RNA sequence: AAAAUUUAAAUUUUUUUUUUUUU
């Protein structure tokens, strides 16, 4: 069904738009494990 | 709230062996030519020695059992020969006799013929069949009647005429093999030897696809012969072949000269006649420079002199057909046959006209040319009739016609030798430019003069009309063998039948296409470099500590966080209202050339008066000038322009031990590294030779005042910049302020040096894969992107499934090669010929069978033009999707690929018009008409195929109805050699 | 401005008599 699952895509589209909006490199400095979790969340991707 | 606007919002933001060259040298009878001195140094016999080269090498499969062919004692002359054969020919026939394929690449006069003569009988005595190749019918017509006289039992295969289909020996043109390699002639199944002549036409950007692919389509059992003009890069071919059919292949190079050549320069209306290249192939500078001196119609002096010199025959070369006809008239007051010979001319000539109808025995163009032909004079170009084309060359070969006015066919048209070659136009049009002719062009355009057993020498005479550059006349005449590389492209009928034949693929063609041999050769060298780089990397690869990587990972976080701040330090609507003279400032232009600490001369803005609409940065329209004492002594102080930051080179700081001076540079806000908080005496005296040098010593006195460091204008405390954007930005460094100092061995255990220990590993970490990306980028078939677009096309056309299974639509043009197969399916699938008559649709078939543009035809009778308007409507939508295919084809230019002008003449030959009458309706020469007429039969016959495959019974009634109405009187032309 | 480019359709002999279907 289009209107359901794409609304869930739009939900994650905005969340994807919500992702690299913050400065992300600063805790990649403060640990690898931030970056590695960001790597692990990219492993979902 | 369109559903792509969520993309738009801003978020919520906080092999080589048997390699030898051999030498061969003989003596030649003396000759002076038309220079009155001898051409070379004489020997004691009155002879003149020449010498030439015999290279041999062979390409190797891996692990192959090799014995040297120089040792190969040939047990039997499978063809014996009357005279002494040559050493490379001796080297040649052993390769045939021992049974491996071989390229020999020589000139046509050398005797490459003789090697082809041998393998026939070795095929014949083993009852094998053999293919002799040619690009031209008349090349075969030479070789056929020759071999027909020689061995007799030889099959000829031509689009014009087949003779004796089940003979033992076969002579045929290139595409017929390709055609009978697609549908698998069993004719092939008794063939073990192939004679490829004219191999270098693989670099034909027009047709060279055929020679390349057909060799790829060979079974690997077969032995092969390869004959072509001398190329320097012959081995590449053998290096290509020996893998892809997996058997050895020899090479033989020579540069041999059969009859000896003498190059002369005639300035048009100049009177110097200068041997500038001897038979020993030496550039005479001085004769050329005398020819440079002797440069201050003209032919008519030259020829009777040559006729006084008795250097008949003589061949004139234009760069266009019409020029010869002019040059025919510029010479025609002479005569060079006896009336016995002119009776011998005319009587035999009428036998040439005997094979025409008596109505055709009075055709106008032949009436005109015949008195020139009576005058011992001939012209060569395509535009004549083929019956005209053959009779001349005969009489040329039988020497009645001392003169030939020729173009580039007769350059390729061999077995018709000359004594004297005339270069009337030095340059020549190459499709793009009337260019200075390149080397192997001229070398191919050289050797045609000089009969082997008869002519003493070769006479080379070039008329020039420019004082040419010296290396160009070298690069033309002291020439180079031109490089032979694949002109492989794609074509859709090929794309058809490789799906239609099951066993192989079009991709498979690309795996063995020579067009990527560029992508073959240099890469193992770079692999060797990679095999080097994968080793040198392994030396520094492990340091003492892992944390130095993490320190570099800290340093990676260090290096970027300083990077982002300086572009915010260099703020465009800042470093402003603080730029006053004497304010002590740190100077580092653009992040490229750091100039220490200086004092502001002034601040200004660059005004662009010459270009109103250009862009400077809001940094860079602002011009600051600053005295530094960090200027190098030998910088071009006089060459930098005031208030322009365009600094030339040599302007730099004083390097290690170099003398520092003071100078003033125009700088912008990008040059500002930082700005301090002190103001010394900045002189209102601008430039009086020692106020900028008092700045720098005062800078040195300020370098006495703060030798440690100037308190910089803090954006917090001094410039009072208070932005939550700006202040939170520094926090990235405010970890590095902490954490770098916090880390164990920040610089203990020589970690600074151990950084470079890591870094020299880390650079090797970078640059191999950087190279290895390039090599992995240097892998694949680059043509797939073309092909993958063409895979779209037929699916868009419905010629096959997306599972690539060919439809009946695509099954149509399987017997179509002779035209646009992409269009011709759709026209018949648009069925517009149901109400076309045989006179009507034939004019539409004139829209295919001919390419070269000419004068405008009128807008014809619209029952032609409206179908012509109809087919034009079809191909656009086709080319539309081709434009949609990312296939870079101009749809407009794709239409004028179709030429629509002879349709009237086509419409009237359908109505039984006279050949005489229709000659009036064009400038296009009469054979060229027949060259599309006999093309048009090949079309209509392949059109007869289609309704058989569809069942359009009306069409089949209509198809041969056309074929009746074209195939007739003058279209029935046959040749004389056959 | 020249230059030239394509095909191929199949031949000569072994068999057994007829009636007979419901006013």
UniProtKB/Swiss-Prot annotation, chain A:
It comes from the Eukaryota. Belongs to the exosome component 10/RRP6 family. Nuclear-specific catalytic component of the RNA exosome complex which has 3'->5' exoribonuclease activity and participates in a multitude of cellular RNA processing and degradation events. In the nucleus, the RNA exosome complex is involved in proper maturation of stable RNA species such as rRNA, snRNA and snoRNA, in the elimination of RNA processing by-products and non-coding 'pervasive' transcripts, such as antisense RNA species and cryptic unstable transcripts (CUTs), and of mRNAs with processing defects, thereby limiting or excluding their export to the cytoplasm. Disruption phenotype: Deletion mutant is temperature-sensitive. Impaired growth at 37 degrees Celsius. Impaired growth at all temperatures, nonviable at 37 degrees Celsius. Mutant is defective in the 3' processing of the 5.8S rRNA and accumulates a discrete species, 5.8S + 30, that is 3' extended by 30 nucleotides. Accumulates 7S RNA. Accumulates 5' external transcribed spacer (ETS) RNA. Accumulates extended forms of snR40 small nucleolar RNA (snoRNA). Accumulates U24 + 3 snoRNA. Accumulates poly(A)+ snoRNAs. This is Exosome complex exonuclease RRP6. Present with 2160 molecules/cell in log phase SD medium. The gene is RRP6. Transmembrane segments: none annotated. Component of the RNA exosome complex. Specifically part of the catalytically inactive RNA exosome core complex (Exo-9) which may associate with the catalytic subunits RRP6 and DIS3 in cytoplasmic- and nuclear-specific RNA exosome complex forms. Exo-9 is formed by a hexameric base ring of RNase PH domain-containing subunits and a cap ring consisting of CSL4, RRP4 and RRP40. RRP6 specifically is part of the nuclear form of the RNA exosome complex; the association appears to be mediated by Exo-9 and not by DIS3. Interacts with LRP1. Interacts with NPL3, NOP53 and PAP1. It comes from Saccharomyces cerevisiae (strain ATCC 204508 / S288c). It is found in: Nucleus, Nucleolus; Nucleus.
Curated annotation (Swiss-Prot), chain B:
Pfam families: DEAD, DSHCT, Helicase_C, MTR4-like_stalk, MTR4_beta-barrel. The keyword Iron does not apply. Its main location: nucleus. A motif (DEVH box) lies at residues 197-200. SUPFAM superfamilies: P-loop containing nucleoside triphosphate hydrolases, Prismane protein-like. Keywords: ATP-binding, Helicase, Hydrolase, Nucleotide-binding, Nucleus, Phosphoprotein, rRNA processing. Residues 298-502 form the Helicase C-terminal domain. GO terms for cellular component: nucleolus; nucleus; TRAMP complex. It catalyses: ATP + H2O = ADP + phosphate + H(+). It is found in: Nucleus. ATP binds at residues 106-113. Residues 93-249 form the Helicase ATP-binding domain. One of its GO terms (molecular function) is ATP hydrolysis activity. It comes from the Eukaryota. Its EC number is 3.6.4.13. GO terms for biological process: exonucleolytic trimming to generate mature 3'-end of 5.8S rRNA from tricistronic rRNA transcript (SSU-rRNA, 5.8S rRNA, LSU-rRNA); maturation of 5.8S rRNA; mRNA processing; nuclear mRNA surveillance; nuclear mRNA surveillance of mRNA 3'-end processing; nuclear polyadenylation-dependent mRNA catabolic process; nuclear polyadenylation-dependent rRNA catabolic process; poly(A)-dependent snoRNA 3'-end processing. The modification Phosphoserine is found at residues 19, 748. Belongs to the helicase family. SKI2 subfamily. Present with 12500 molecules/cell in log phase SD medium. ATP-dependent RNA helicase required for the 3'-end formation of 5.8S RNA. Cofactor for the exosome complex that unwinds secondary structure in pre-rRNA. Required for nucleocytoplasmic transport of mRNA. May serve as a chaperone which translocates or normalizes the structure of mRNAs in preparation for export. Component of the TRAMP complex which has a poly(A) RNA polymerase activity and is involved in a post-transcriptional quality control mechanism limiting inappropriate expression of genetic information. Component of the TRAMP complex (also called TRF4 complex) composed of at least HUL4, MTR4, PAP2/TRF4 and either AIR1 or AIR2. This is ATP-dependent RNA helicase DOB1.
